[model samples]
Target: QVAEHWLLQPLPEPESRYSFWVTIVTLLAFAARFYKIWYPKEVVFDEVHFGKFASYYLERSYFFDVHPPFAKMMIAFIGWLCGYDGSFKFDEIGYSYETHPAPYIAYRSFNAILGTLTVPIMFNTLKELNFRAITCAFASLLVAIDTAHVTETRLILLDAILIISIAATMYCYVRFYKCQLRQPFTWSWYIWLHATGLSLSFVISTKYVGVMTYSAIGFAAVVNLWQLLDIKAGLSLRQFMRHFSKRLNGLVLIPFVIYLFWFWVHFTVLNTSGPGDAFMSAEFQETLKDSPLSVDSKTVNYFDIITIKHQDTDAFLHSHLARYPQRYEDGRISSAGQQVTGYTHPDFNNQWEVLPPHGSDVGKGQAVLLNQHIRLRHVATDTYLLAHDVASPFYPTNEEITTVTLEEGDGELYPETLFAFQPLKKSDEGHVLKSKTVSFRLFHVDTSVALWTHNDELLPDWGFQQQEINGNKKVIDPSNNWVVDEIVNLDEVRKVYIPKVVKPLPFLKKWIETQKSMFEHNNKLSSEHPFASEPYSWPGSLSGVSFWTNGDEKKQIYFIGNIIGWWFQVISLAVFVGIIVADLITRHRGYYALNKMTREKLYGPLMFFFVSWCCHYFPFFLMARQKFLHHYLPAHLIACLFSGALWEVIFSDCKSLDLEKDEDISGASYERNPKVYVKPYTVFLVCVSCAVAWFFVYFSPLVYGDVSLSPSEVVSREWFDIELNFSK
Candidate 1:
């Protein structure tokens, strides 16, 4: 009777044992979140993309992708203050080359700050539910220490912000439910909660996963209202149903308003121009009609040209699209000649023919050389000339042409002699000379190609194993063994073709003569044209190249730092594992000793474990993988349900635990009532799991990639191409 009377009485003042504990937990949550705010100084992982996007937002007031503007906007705001360039300057124009460094550090710092703030917000949220201070503190602490939260927070991305927004909305809903007892429909409270919901919806627009949280929160609100209506009035089920229906209508409307506003804001502010817009524009259609050929067509055509070159035995051939004239029996030329045709003969015959067979009249006896002198021509004119080799009058007999080797500078053309030809001058006006001297100049070659070809020659020279002349072969020289070295030496010197020896650069050449000096002075950045010159160290941290190289030891410092951070995370995980194991053992012992006490029944332990597992697993499995943490609202609500049930049990069982006889017992056992002891402990367990998950997510430094940097390492520069196709 005494216990019943005690329960019937109004609850004690707000400043009780539970309140004190909650206060301590809230403070702890704040401390954990704020601590080590800037440990690793560099961007850790995907910040490469998101961080740069944020910078773009700040600089350009918009970004080029399809995402809600809120999270990125916040990141951009922070980056702007911190002076980080969010533009993806380092990505190649075609996403092929490296660009300037992204300000990942600044962007990550902002996310970390927001992540830390969530801890305190969550603490107060639980307190509003009338949960004991210890439970609130435990939940907050778990969040503070969570490695997942920590790693994500340190990244300058949208996931953390999206998670926090959804969480804040959930917290507001919980508070509204509790405040309903005093004020059924306080406009301020409803407005505040609804606004949070709307903001969260905006976060959802950034990532589709936000729908999970939105759905969970909406369901929880309906359930909570239904429960409140049922408990307040001993009304019939139908009457209770009516009240629930009305409240549900209002709740639904609130979320709807938020969603509508979200759409409005997104469309109004974010629908600007970008690369994708060009594809859908009328201008793109006009461009397609005008040219009948696009850049993509040209690119594909280049590949086709190379393929055709390989199929033809002759090295010299014009592949460009052009019209040519055709030859007939008469001496006159026909402007409309054979259409440009691809090489399709089974033999892949030479493009140019010299001698004619015995039955055919041999008009020209010139022989075509299979050397570099062969030139491929692609003329723009509509007329192209082609004549039968046998009918041509240039070389009347085969004896007229001969292959002759001449000493260096000893040929008729003095100074020109790798191989030179002396053409016989024709006197007849009707006859035209077609064959000219063929000269071969060794300009540059690659040693790697020479070595590869040499090795191929040494292999058993089966007919099948011999070198196949492909289009690539024409470009890849394989016989010039010493050509590469000579080219390297002569590369600095400007060659002269007139009457004298080619002199290399003088010993006291200008400082700018060296490649390094040209880059240092910004005259040219890269050896390759179209790329600005700059000093570059191969395979450096910012190179965007990620394989082990010769200087791996020096380049791996950042990678090693990530490893050390992960090791610390492992230690924390080990401690968590120990605690979990101990809890399991205690539950097992309680189950075995059923006669020990009603409060110690196996059911409490099993329920606690179930709640703990749900809290941990559901979020990770369903929500955590959704690109943001907010999607776990349903998981958190489930956790809260177990926590509330546990609290009820703890309060009911207070007396049996001998709380009045031992003051220490009350502190240790949570509630003074023995009947409700199970409830409180179960809630405590849920709190512990929430705290742990949150800790791993927001505070831990263990990340997946080798992007973290030490204080000593400063980002020198970032460079990459940005190819923008104005026409679709």
Candidate 2:
């Protein structure tokens, strides 16, 4: 039993100075980050919103904005220490508005401090990954010189905070994974890692897009779980269940509890206590009521007016003659009286009353006639017809009456006239007079007419014109009695109607009216004389000649920046690909061959780091399109830092172990041979790269654009020009 135990024991430890070297490297990294507190004074990109939000949170205790407030809370704490006015109201002239610069500067200062500190954290974490002192130092150095990292750190933004949170979570997982392998079932370490992961979930919630990181964490957890499960080797079903319970409760359940807490925090902080508090407040309701009209109903909400018809009492008129019987003049009684007396009857009534009058007529007439009094009523209906009466020659008998036919016919001949003849006996006067009731069906014509008429004639050219009604031929005559009824397209109309103009008070209405008048006057003036107009015309008489200038000063600057960025990306990609190919080829030779041995341990960590790096970089590339200073700086900083770290990790300690063994040098002698190297050439490489990066930032104007040459040009050119050319 003793011999068996001895055989199963792990390898003995090696006496080395590696621990001291690691401490030295860690301190160096920390010092490098801490020395530069306020390198760039100005607020870098997106710092404006964050800085303002911080100020707001400090002043109000709680603040409402589009994003979660955890990141802002941290910024607010920092800003409070830096003499910022902690006001929730977001004073229009302070950090909240574009015009305010001081508060923004203060906020950026805090970010710069946080960013510098992240360098050391990265170095320590890399060291924990079993990286050599050189590899860890190189990572630290890369982070130190990373332009985007430095710039972003100097500004108050959520990205830097997110980076730190994700980094912490990764560190905790690494610790947990290491502990679990050694102890088999350690609950404390696993719970600790879970807690860190849960905290990271909160970080992700702060910036909704950061949720992708949560998925990555979940994937890593599942992989780790599978690895732990496989370690049980071959066990019975009951034993497997027991092992699963131990791992799940200790590792998964604790972390999930923490995650639930983080979610709880997010909700508790985001939601309002009362009804009035909301991220999108009633202000949006008012804004919704004030959107403009568009061609598509979905684009705006103005289709409601078109869908549901509105009745106008003034547009409607009713006739009493149509509702009651029409009484004709009694010429027989008057003629008989006249013939009998050989004179006209004085009491003969000339006017006929179709219905009883509602009220007396206001106008003075022969007998104060009330028959003409008419009342108009508005009614809701789907169909309406516009009709007018005209004199016809075929009135009582032998009168040619033109009746519109409802039946379908050709375009030219509408309501085809069907004539019926009845023979009538002529009196002594040789003229036949007969009364007949004419029943003619009229077809409803769908037409749209413009409201304005020129020279007492409808503008037929303006609106929708129809040549036929119900498949029947119809002539639309402006001079004749014509009515227009619109065929509503209900499906095309939108349900909700938001009008551009809402009812306002007299003052606002007057102001709008005045502005409109001024606009109209200016438009009229500009339209009248192109050459004489101040806005459109040049000061001199060279207005008519148009020329296209090819040069764009801004474009030149952007072109140069883009070219440089592309070159950097290409070189970085090429280096990464070359390293991967070399590593893969070398790894295939044998497990014990040269650098192949270390690749097994280092490749997994390197791959994990690269994945994290990609997560940081993709967002930066996407956000770089924004021209505003606030957006670019934070993204640029994070990307540059990650890029620098990636470069360091990829190149450090990448040589073959055979070469080190062959050299038999002091630190090189120990290769995966149980002894750790105290000092390596990779460390020098890291220091050199960091120094060169610093030199570039300090001297080269490449990073600053054309603005870098401004002071130099003003001092040299302006002064020289004044001295050389005397005033005439």
Candidate 3:
């Protein structure tokens, strides 16, 4: 009777026990993260990039990075609190952070603090899901001792913040779901729901990888909503409508607002133009004070050799001596004309001479007016560029770009060979073309199409992997915009320089353009890296990245997970799949492998987490971007939660409660509890924890990089034998 009463109590007097374990976990997490953190006072791995980004934020300078702004803002805010000047650029490895006035220790400690907090958050998330306290502690222990997590958190990196936000997202989500079982539309429910939304936004705003978290949570919500939509459920149509509206507000609207808030902060702080100006469009760059576009722009004239760059992609209008293949592998046909392509790099072939229409009296050094028909004659081959009404190799609906022979061009002037300049900005409508300042679309006069270059795919090797320039019928599209990035004859000609006034771009337009550029450049980062890893190798601890090294001392921060914990999680996932398949097969044969309550409590969350694991891990396989083992941390964190949930299912004797209590179909009674029988796995868990702790100890040198090891000593730690720098 006393035990039942204890279980029934709202704030389980077991709270003392729960808090004790949480404290223990928190202490260990801090110890693992903070020990010797001040050692190596030099830049480590991506600290060079992320730390510099924080300095940029401190200086309020505009820069382009692939990630969103929240976490970098947090790092800069820490720097601001420390009274550190933003002078150090964090430009390269081996630069000592201690020599500068930068508060490097505090920066790392900030992430360590966040990383430590993530442990308790994971523990509480599992506890909230009603797992036994031991399972909860075990999960937290796994996360705390994981070498990768420790190494990541101890450095100036965003993954620590990202991992914790991911944990908090799960915690808030489960708490909100738990609230649904007690009451609907209550203060507790509303608070948790909003928190879930806020947490969702926090993770995504930290990095785009948070999309995996959003996907995982969104899948669970969809499943729960479907369950509620059943006729057997007792929700009235109006009540369900309220539920939908509330979710819409909390999940969709709130996150959207918070996401916009970060970008707002990003743009507001970066008022001065920096290195990122070159990546943005002319209008976008003009918003920043003292932008290069305003300083270097000169009026473009006829007879000048210039490089026209695609505004959206930064690809140059190029034509080489190579010819296109008569047939593509896909059975599409080409004209076998001179190759006119978009080249990302500068080449002599990219230069074109601005010429007047045949029979016009336009001369060299004359200002080229907007709306005047012009021809781009390839400076290397001296052929006129033409866009004809034939299918491109990639886009059948788009027209092909080719060069016309000088004989053919001089014999008869075709409209296909003439392109009209339509200025992008209203202020430049009737003005002369200006380098790096005026953005205009080239309208092919013959087909009424715009000249466009797509970045999504490059032309095949016959065209040397260059981007394809085609005549897009969507004439008003942003992809059609081009800018005269450079004028080859600026010094040679009697030039009139024009300075552009800094006009502020609307916030929404700037934000949209920034997002497009980020994604575009992010996808374009398929360049090779020496230490990059594949997703398949991530789960098994088959690979690691070398973050830093002290050459003479043979010390390094080699990033790898705790072998035991990672392998444990991988085994748990496999067991989960096995159990799920076996149970489904048994149930299909009319045997209920699990009772109603166990199925609801165990399978639902485990399935959700498994789905989350796949969502976070599997998507890497589809990405064309360069990846590293750090990319696996998000999935590894989810799998830690999954490991905890699966263990509960493995030990719990659910047959005690074969009969489920009858209840209304409202969300309030969705999850019901009678009594759960969890077999004691205390000894086994302790043993596993000891092994995890031991391996963490063995790998501690690699994590801290404070102890120099002899070659054989480093070799002793190499289990999988994948390259570790110290082993050499």
Candidate 4:
């Protein structure tokens, strides 16, 4: 009865009994998550992606990824602090850390430690909601024993920190919510609110997917605030405004500020150029150049050896006198001509001179107009830029071949021979050639096709791994556009102004554009790979992920759920739902189906966990984004938590029937009736301990890739079918 009504009684403190068991289970969780941190002593799966970022951090180089930088920054900090000097490099197949494996261990250990803390965090948060230490302890143990948590946390990954941050955020918000129930607008309550907001910032900055947690937390806040608005604290209008303003700042402003601030920090570390530059505007790439950071640089015009570079590949536009592939000779389009393609190295062939307005095949030092209809004749081949109806050799079905040829002889100087450079972003006044941040697209006057380089496939050995220049017949292709790195006029050159901060207007604009692309990339990514699993397959343990494998030996680390533990959770949820339905039916029948007394008795905790489970789980289904098996870890954590409140329903014969129920409660209020003594409950818990202990003992070997156990041996003892995906 004391346990059931304690929360309703107000201002309940953390019970020592609950804290004791929480410690025990949390310690066990730490060890379970920490074991085999150095499995295979090499990076696996997404670790290749994150591990490279960690090394990049050590080198202070800039790179781009779909996720926020906070967690990766923490990883780099921890890995570096532990003495990793960023020496190893990764191949498409693998990475070699040979003698010095400390960095890898140090990097992975960071995630292991955070993953270990997830259980303790869950226990504290669950305890706040359930208001029963005993129940919270069991829930903590459930999380500690969860197979997904253990297996996923053993490596270097953002999810570990993300989970920890989520738990922290949830705990802080619940604490604030609890504190507000006791005394609205009090200092302690404000402290919790501030903590919640602070932790909320961390949760989101760790990953873009964190928006779900933010929304859940936000929903909880809105509900709490709505209920508070109904409370008659009887304050003056000024006092009310003050209180509301405090909440507005604490709940909204603080988190928003923190999130934006992290982006600033992101810009701080992303100081050097990387492969992702091509994804941005030409001006953005200019800021990333390795040249000295400067407030000013010169801008040159035509007649110079201006460079037209592919944004992503960093290749320069090149022209060679060599004829177009044999298809041109087949009379598909025009006469044999000089082929135009992107090349990695600089040479005479890569140089081009723009004919100025007055005509000379090569200008002296004339200023190039942003919309100039001029001739771009290759300096090495001494021919005009030309395009025809001929399909390219490689892309014969779709792409038309573009080349450079002589005027009237090999054919040029016609409408197609006249090329106009139009800056996609034009100024009020026309831009001068080589103006800083000038982005130009070539317009074939006759064909009306835009010129851009295709980075999709190589142009063949003759073109190196260089990109292919194609005349885009469709609407403007950003991929086809070129950013002028500099206009290298014969004697003088002009360079774009490289500012420390991105041009404010363009920065904000592209920031949003980048997010749209990122979201598109995430949802569209799918494949027929053997390792992928649908999000639906995760909860039931219907599918398992193959973390790693070996062809020579069959023994492998299989990331399957604990059958008993998972069943326990599934059954608990089922039992909880049954309880709710029964209570509703009984209430309609004139019984106090979960009346204030019984609800305050046990349903309070039941309802809280149920809502939480929904908040965490259902959102995944609504997400059209690509879902991976590992993404289910957070939902599993919440499920394991809600499942803990049902321990009594399973094993305890005692239910506290003497409840002084409170009406119309917003937060959790549990209730029940007493029956048998505490001994049965203790015995039940003891059995639980042994069950989880032996369970992990059997499963840990597979999780850690135990060499002692043969696949046949494990298969024989395994309760779940050893799905053949397990890697030896």
Off by over 4 Å in 2: 1-44, 59-66, 79-85, 88-106, 231-596, 614-671, 674-680, 683-696, 699-708, 711-728
What's each prediction's clash count?
68, 14, 0, 22
Flag regions of model 4 displaced more than 4 Å. Answer: 1-4, 8-20, 40-43, 48-69, 79-102, 126-137, 173-190, 208-249, 267-300, 306-346, 355-376, 384-538, 544-567, 592-598, 629-631, 653-728
User: By TM-score, is 2 or 3 better?
Assistant: 3
RMSD of each: 21.1, 23.2, 11.4, 6.7
Question: TM-scores, in order shown?
Answer: 0.45, 0.45, 0.71, 0.72
Superposed Cα deviation of residue 59, candidate 2 (Å): 4.4
lDDT of model number 3: 0.83
Winning candidate number (TM-score):
4
Name the lDDT value of residue 179 in candidate 4.
74
The global Cα lDDT (0 to 1) of model 1 is: 0.37
lDDT score at residue 537, model 4, on the 0-100 scale: 67
TM-score of 3: 0.71
> Model 1 — which ten-residue stretch has the worst lDDT?
482-491
Looking at model 3, which ten-residue stretch has the lowest summed lDDT? 1-10
* Candidate 3: tens digits of C-alpha lDDT, residues 1-728: 11112122363228877888989989999999999988788998999988898888887788998889999989989998988667899989989876775788999999999999999999998787667777788889999889999999999999888999999999999888877766779999999999999999999999898998999989888877776777767888888888889988999899999999999999998887777876787688778776543455677889888999998889999998898788867788888888889999998898988899989988877899997899889989989999887788888899889898878877764677898788765555667887775689988887888889988888887888889998899988887999898887676334443344679778899999999988988887578888788889899988888889998888888999888899999999998888778767866675654655556544567777889899999999998778898999989998998997787667765552322332222332322443434435677788889999999999888999988888898888776646777666
Best by lDDT: 3
lDDT of 1 by residue, 405-495 (tens): 2231134422111211111111212222111111122111211111111222211222122222111112233332111001111111222
Q: What is the Cα-based lDDT of residue 478 in candidate 1?
A: 32
